Fold this protein.
Amino acid sequence: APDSVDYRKKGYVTPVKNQGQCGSCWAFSSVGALEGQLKKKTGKLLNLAPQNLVDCVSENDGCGGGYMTNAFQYVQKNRGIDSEDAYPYVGQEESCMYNPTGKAAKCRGYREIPEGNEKALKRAVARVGPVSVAIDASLTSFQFYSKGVYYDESCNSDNLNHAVLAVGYGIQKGNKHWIIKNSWGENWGNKGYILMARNKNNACGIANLASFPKM
Ligand SMILES: NC(=O)SCC(=O)Nc1ccccc1C(=O)O
Ligand SMILES: NC(=O)SCC(=O)Nc1ccccc1C(=O)O
Ligand SMILES: NC(=O)SCC(=O)Nc1ccccc1C(=O)O
């Protein structure tokens, strides 16, 4: 496998977004993975609409949480997802207002990484593109992260409470990491990103609920 991967350097990753007071991290994670596949397939990088997912994925709970796999299935069965420009993010729940004229991507299904398998996650990032993952982001240590490779041995791999996007991996001064795009704005972390420990016993459950869309 490649020793390091960073899809930001390939033009597969849109700017960091800010979910606001709505618990829609799952929707941001899902749009990020769809954005990466759309760029890889077509050469177009475009912001896709997390609001489309928040309002329209009936199997999820809007601002109360959701699964990325349900989001991918919705895009597949709906035969589309809007661009952000066609369906802007408002950070609150509302009726589904999907508009097929603003459709910007389709999905042919989704794939899951075997639970707990960081090597498989690394293979997916290398061969597929950015991957949607869920983690335990509840610790104040995560909340106040600024730089370096984040590792907290007290993180719980079974407490998956936040969804983010794995856009790469590498090693910094001997510490293997995942490059993670969050949705807490650019003023959080390192310009909106965090490096999370890799191959440290599935730290924070990073490989427990990982998936990507087919396009
Ligand atoms: N709660 C609602 O109003 S249904 C919104 C909507 O567009 N749903 C859908 C539309 C197309 C395909 C799948 C779904 C789904 O819910 O899974
Ligand atoms: N390019 C990819 O998505 S590989 C992801 C994946 O599911 N990998 C795997 C799945 C099952 C077993 C082993 C692996 C492995 O990669 O070692
Ligand atoms: N306690 C905290 O503020 S965690 C750090 C942070 O910037 N969080 C956030 C930033 C932007 C939007 C949402 C959140 C959130 O926590 O839900």
In short: DSSP finds five helices and ten strands in the chain. Helices lie at 25-42, 50-56, 68-78, 118-127, 140-143. The chain has one domain: 1-215.
